[PDB]
Amino acid sequence: MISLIAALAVDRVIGMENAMPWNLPADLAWFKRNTLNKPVIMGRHTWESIGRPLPGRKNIILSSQPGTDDRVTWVKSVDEAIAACGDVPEIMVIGGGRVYEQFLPKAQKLYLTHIDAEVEGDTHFPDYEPDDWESVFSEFHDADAQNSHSYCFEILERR
Ligand SMILES: NC(=O)c1ccc[n+]([C@@H]2O[C@H](COP(=O)([O-])OP(=O)(O)OC[C@H]3O[C@@H](n4cnc5c(N)ncnc54)[C@H](OP(=O)(O)O)[C@@H]3O)[C@@H](O)[C@H]2O)c1
Ligand SMILES: Nc1nc(=O)c2nc(CNc3ccc(C(=O)N[C@@H](CCC(=O)O)C(=O)O)cc3)cnc2[nH]1
Ligand SMILES: [Mn+2]
Ligand SMILES: [Mn+2]
Ligand SMILES: [Mn+2]
């Protein structure tokens, strides 16, 4: 099974200048819980944005060019990325925009955080078709001293 996980600001913005400008510790904790002990697939730009391997997960990087770090696994196509995960119950696709576009048609589940924040971005989550997806979990949180925007955790499953 393939799942996508992402955090979206207003208008599906996910990034600006190869960074995420907000800071929501509760959402990063949600990301860790939902990805630990699973393989994670990311594009090369997102690898550079994170800047180090994510511990406790098999890190698989898509790039058309040879890899430059043997602490992670490098692959050259979507099918190779999936194969490199092996026989696991759930593969997590962790972006960025280009990678999400390619894996969305193959995904059964979306883990989306909707953040009540406006930021001028250059990368968006794919326009997906709402009719194709059932919301099976949603949990809203007001802003607090650690998290400066309100946010909603949602899990959707392909109908
Ligand atoms: N808010 C969130 O949830 C979230 C999550 C992830 C990322 N982000 C943000 O998203 C932005 C990065 O997204 P992005 O769309 O620019 O880049 P991306 O999807 O992370 O990386 C694109 C790169 O991946 C490689 N690639 C993708 N598909 C491939 C394929 N089929 N075969 C081979 N290589 C492939 C290519 O690398 P080569 O050029 O080396 O061939 C391509 O240039 C950053 O701002 C980041 O902070 C946000
Ligand atoms: N919901 C969601 N939020 C995100 O921030 C997110 N980020 C990415 C890509 N970028 C990043 C950037 C940093 C870390 C990171 O530092 N993660 C640590 C945090 C642990 C914690 O804060 O408790 C990790 O071990 O996962 C992960 C992904 C992909 N999907 C996402 N999905
Ligand atoms: Mn092929
Ligand atoms: Mn197999
Ligand atoms: Mn806000």
Side-chain angles (χ1 to χ4, degrees):
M1 174 173 69
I2 294 167
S3 299
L4 278 57
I5 182 159
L8 281 57
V10 165
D11 290 341
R12 314 194 319 279
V13 169
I14 64 170
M16 180 54 175
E17 293 172 323
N18 216 41
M20 298 187 307
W22 62 78
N23 171 32
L24 286 180
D27 177 55
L28 287 180
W30 161 267
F31 172 90
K32 185 176 181 177
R33 186 173 64 90
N34 285 296
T35 61
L36 203 62
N37 302 314
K38 304 179 188 173
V40 295
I41 298 173
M42 73 194 87
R44 182 187 50 88
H45 295 309
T46 294
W47 162 246
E48 292 177 11
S49 182
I50 299 171
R52 60 270 298 157
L54 292 168
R57 283 149 282 191
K58 184 173 187 171
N59 291 223
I60 295 164
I61 325 300
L62 277 155
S63 174
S64 65
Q65 300 312 314
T68 55
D69 190 326
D70 279 345
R71 300 176 296 167
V72 300
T73 296
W74 297 83
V75 298
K76 301 186 192 298
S77 69
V78 167
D79 286 328
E80 190 187 0
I82 294 168
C85 295
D87 186 5
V88 298
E90 187 175 24
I91 296 170
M92 303 299 293
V93 175
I94 73 166
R98 295 295 295 174
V99 170
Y100 288 136
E101 287 173 0
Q102 290 168 83
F103 279 89
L104 178 65
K106 303 177 155 292
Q108 277 277 292
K109 193 165 182 179
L110 307 177
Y111 298 75
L112 300 181
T113 304
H114 309 276
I115 304 172
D116 180 36
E118 283 265 13
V119 291
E120 286 282 1
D122 58 21
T123 310
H124 295 78
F125 194 77
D127 209 4
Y128 65 92
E129 168 53 61
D131 296 354
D132 287 351
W133 297 91
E134 178 182 355
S135 183
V136 299
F137 174 85
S138 67
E139 183 182 278
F140 178 71
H141 296 267
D142 277 306
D144 63 25
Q146 292 178 52
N147 297 279
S148 60
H149 303 278
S150 57
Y151 54 98
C152 186
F153 297 134
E154 189 176 25
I155 302 172
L156 301 100
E157 288 177 356
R158 187 184 288 275
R159 294 186 176 282

Short mmCIF file of all heavy atoms in Angstrom, two decimals, residues 82-83 85-88, ligand 4:
data_model
loop_
_atom_site.label_atom_id
_atom_site.label_comp_id
_atom_site.label_asym_id
_atom_site.label_seq_id
_atom_site.Cartn_x
_atom_site.Cartn_y
_atom_site.Cartn_z
N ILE A 82 9.53 1.91 -5.48
CA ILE A 82 8.61 0.99 -4.84
C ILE A 82 9.32 -0.34 -4.56
O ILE A 82 9.21 -0.91 -3.47
CB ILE A 82 7.35 0.80 -5.70
CG1 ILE A 82 6.57 2.12 -5.78
CG2 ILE A 82 6.50 -0.32 -5.15
CD1 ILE A 82 5.47 2.11 -6.82
N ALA A 83 10.04 -0.86 -5.55
CA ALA A 83 10.74 -2.14 -5.38
C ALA A 83 11.73 -2.07 -4.23
O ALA A 83 11.88 -3.04 -3.47
CB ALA A 83 11.42 -2.55 -6.69
N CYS A 85 11.58 -0.64 -1.51
CA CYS A 85 10.92 -0.74 -0.22
C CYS A 85 10.74 -2.16 0.26
O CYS A 85 10.55 -2.39 1.46
CB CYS A 85 9.55 -0.07 -0.26
SG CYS A 85 9.61 1.70 -0.52
N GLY A 86 10.73 -3.12 -0.65
CA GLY A 86 10.50 -4.49 -0.26
C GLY A 86 9.04 -4.74 0.05
O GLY A 86 8.15 -3.95 -0.25
N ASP A 87 8.81 -5.87 0.70
CA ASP A 87 7.46 -6.34 1.01
C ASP A 87 7.08 -5.82 2.39
O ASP A 87 7.23 -6.49 3.41
CB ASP A 87 7.40 -7.86 0.96
CG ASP A 87 5.99 -8.40 1.12
OD1 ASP A 87 5.05 -7.57 1.17
OD2 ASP A 87 5.81 -9.63 1.20
N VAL A 88 6.58 -4.59 2.40
CA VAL A 88 6.15 -3.95 3.64
C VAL A 88 4.67 -3.63 3.49
O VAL A 88 4.17 -3.45 2.37
CB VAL A 88 6.95 -2.67 3.93
CG1 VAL A 88 8.42 -2.99 4.14
CG2 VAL A 88 6.78 -1.61 2.81
MN MN B 4 7.24 -8.00 -3.45
#
